[PDB]
Design a protein around this nucleic acid. Sequence first.
RNA 1: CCCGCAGAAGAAGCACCGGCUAACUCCGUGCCAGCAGCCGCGGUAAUACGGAGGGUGCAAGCGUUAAUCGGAAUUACUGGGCGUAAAGCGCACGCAGGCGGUUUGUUAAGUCAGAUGUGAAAUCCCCGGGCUCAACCUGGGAACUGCAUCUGAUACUGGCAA
RNA 2: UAGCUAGUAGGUGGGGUAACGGCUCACCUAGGCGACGAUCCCUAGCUGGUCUGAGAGGAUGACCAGCCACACUGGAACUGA
Lengths: 205, 82, 80, 129, 157, 123
Amino acid sequence: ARYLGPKLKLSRREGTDLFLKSGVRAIDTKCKIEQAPGQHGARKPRLSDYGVQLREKQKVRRIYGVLERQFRNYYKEAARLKGNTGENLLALLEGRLDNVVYRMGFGATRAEARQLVSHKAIMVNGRVVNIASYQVSPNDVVSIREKAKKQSRVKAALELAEQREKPTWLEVDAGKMEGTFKRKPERSDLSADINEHLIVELYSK
Amino acid sequence: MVTIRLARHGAKKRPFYQVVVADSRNARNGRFIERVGFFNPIASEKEEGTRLDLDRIAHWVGQGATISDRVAALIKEVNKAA
Amino acid sequence: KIRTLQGRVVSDKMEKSIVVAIERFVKHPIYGKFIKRTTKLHVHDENNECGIGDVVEIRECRPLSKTKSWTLVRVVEKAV
Amino acid sequence: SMQDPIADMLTRIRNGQAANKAAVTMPSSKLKVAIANVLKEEGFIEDFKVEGDTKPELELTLKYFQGKAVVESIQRVSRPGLRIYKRKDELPKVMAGLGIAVVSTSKGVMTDRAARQAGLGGEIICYVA
Amino acid sequence: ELQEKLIAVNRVSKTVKGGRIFSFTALTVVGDGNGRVGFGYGKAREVPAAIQKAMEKARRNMINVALNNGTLQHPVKGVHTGSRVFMQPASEGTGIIAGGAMRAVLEVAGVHNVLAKAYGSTNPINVVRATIDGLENMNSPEMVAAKRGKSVEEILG
Amino acid sequence: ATVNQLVRKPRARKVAKSNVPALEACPQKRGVCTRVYTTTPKKPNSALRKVCRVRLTNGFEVTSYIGGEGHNLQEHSVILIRGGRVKDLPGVRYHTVRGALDCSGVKDRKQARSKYGVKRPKA
RNA sequence: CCCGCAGAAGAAGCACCGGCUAACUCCGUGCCAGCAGCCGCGGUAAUACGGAGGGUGCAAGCGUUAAUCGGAAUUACUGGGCGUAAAGCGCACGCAGGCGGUUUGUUAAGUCAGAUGUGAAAUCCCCGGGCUCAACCUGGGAACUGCAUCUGAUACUGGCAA
RNA sequence: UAGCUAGUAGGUGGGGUAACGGCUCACCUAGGCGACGAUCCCUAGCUGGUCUGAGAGGAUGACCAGCCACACUGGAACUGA
């Protein structure tokens, strides 16, 4: 149900830093981005329109860790909700619990935040939650358990997320190891580059 | 006989009840006349699921219906609680 | 006001009863055109009074034979 | 053998716009007068005059915005072969509201918008782009 | 900024006394992304010469069409040779849902949200021409206010 | 296309016929081998094609195709026929399932094993 | 359901990779063996067969077959055609049927509006709630495009009369 | 698959039914249905719904709920609200 394979190969097929390794050593300094993982990656392809749509959908699915049946359920939920369907699709993906954990600064990656949520560490509104795909409501309080507060990888994640950009739809306390999910993010808040119109056009066929 | 009783709906090991007045030879979830409310025995803390409109209850009992044991108890609690 | 249907008489030929064709101006559910559909009824003619060509107001009643559950109230616009 | 005279009027308007005619003449009737009244009221024609007394003739002045015809499309919607009556909710917004549906409601001939604002529907006579 | 798209590359042949001679045709579109669309049809003995012919043909013959914030104004039926294109404006979001050639034309046109359907022959040259005919057949509220001789608010309500 | 002509007799959906009529709207069917032979394809394909005659449990006798490099079918073998037309072979419109009642898997295969009933080879 | 233990420990396959259709090279064989949804591939340098390496897609499932709708505007009411592509009876007359120039009055059957009864519950849709989330369950609503009656309107269609 | 139908169609009267009725008998009249498809043949439980589809439609009617029919096959009543 997870990918659990080579992650930098996923970053290299797309050609974009998906932030799915970490941030400490740089990703070009790991090596070999701009190159597909072939033995034929030295030759880049013509990559037709259905290929381009599929590559943007694969990019957005790999940058969060969501599999395809959950992703098309998210598409149906974004489609039946009123408003811009692609913005609803990105809002429903940012509403996931492990993403809120990784953005708030606990867990250095999204897979690390998923292992943190999985292993019963994180309490949202005074109750611990097992499920990574839990939708964090606005004005919810995301915190850690007693025992998992004294966990050193959460300290290192607090440091390298201090070097990160501190996204503004959530507010981190960082000293009580708490935060709040203040509001729903809009398109201008998040990531500025991904083409959600290509994703909605794929499932619309 | 027309009787007021409980039809059992809901999931497995999480029961829900519709308090509903029906001809008493019909099946438990089968053909009825009208549902005069609902009952939720496992509902939650802070959750109030027990609703009875007493107008149709009194209308049907005045027409000659027969209140079941759970339904008569639930009428007792919602009629002494208010 | 009693429920009453208005129809022309088609045949008068048995005894104490007439056969009456009511036309309804229905609409087609598929194609959308108003088409005319016809319904022949056996109507109980007590007093045996009306003829083949006229219009008759008719209401329904108790069954009277293996057909014939409609009865004449009155003849509006008798004909020749 | 001229079953439909409203479609004859609409064909005359369409052909006069296509052939760049200055004015269009036809036999009149009060239905044609009401349809031409609302076609003046929106701005598809310039005006009209009814001239005869026993054999009455109606003459319409066609409007031409500089390059084109002002009327681009005009379709008889209800036809004698297939009458079309819509309700008050099913009244169509023609050309996303930029064109009119002439509707003969029980207050007379009006447009789609006046029938919807009045609260009543009826036989749709023609879509006018 | 004149973004450019290649729609189709076809190989055509002309027979002579020796044998078959093959050439390549290219159908391209250019556009500002704001209203202006153009289509070009180049033909040359080898492919990138035909692409350059099609681009310099498309850049000249560009027509401007009117479009709302990213959308059409009304439903509109474009027609050409065997193509009976039908394009309906949209609600916001949902992207361009259109097939192939029409998708490329509407994307360089700057139409972000559309619902389109091709009828008849979906041959690429003829559906590009039917698409751009339906686009230049479109009219704006201000121009239909210029026609009927009244302000736009008396038309919209 | 006149609406009166459509009212008097309406538009007619054609008929849907099946290219697998001995399967009787079932996915597979068991039959027994009446004959195991080979035939030649239509003219541009030029091979020998392993095709067996099957009598089915509903009483149809149809020719099925044994697809895969080398088989073990015999006279009176009980096989499971599947459906799917063989394009070159005339009159052959069913396949035999490999991994069936009697029909074994293909030998020494490793890619698309489940299309030929070959178990996963362990090392 | 909550708590304590131990340890990375017990836990990844399936189809595909010529075009459509995302994803490529080597080797074996040589119109044979075989593949194939359609086009088609294999004749000694096979991206199409079989193995390998690499990649792609989905994932506790993945493929095939069967079946239904879609795409198919390919039975077209919305929404097609008929000189030559399939398709105007050989030509008329005419009953049934369909359609009906123009003015006025009346009826109000069609039509329109409103109301009332009905259209079981569930399901579908919206706003919420409860299961750690989701599936699932559930409160209220909307809807059920309909039918009958009643009250009016009367432009348009029909009747009646001139 | 173009004609079908004599209790067949209607009437009077006796009988029968919880109840109207050719429901059944005696009599009288010769009618009733049918090209808005009677009769015959083939297939089929019907509906709320389900699936698909932009919609209109099309296909369907497992589960869940309403109605019907049946209870080895053919028939008959008894008892009883």
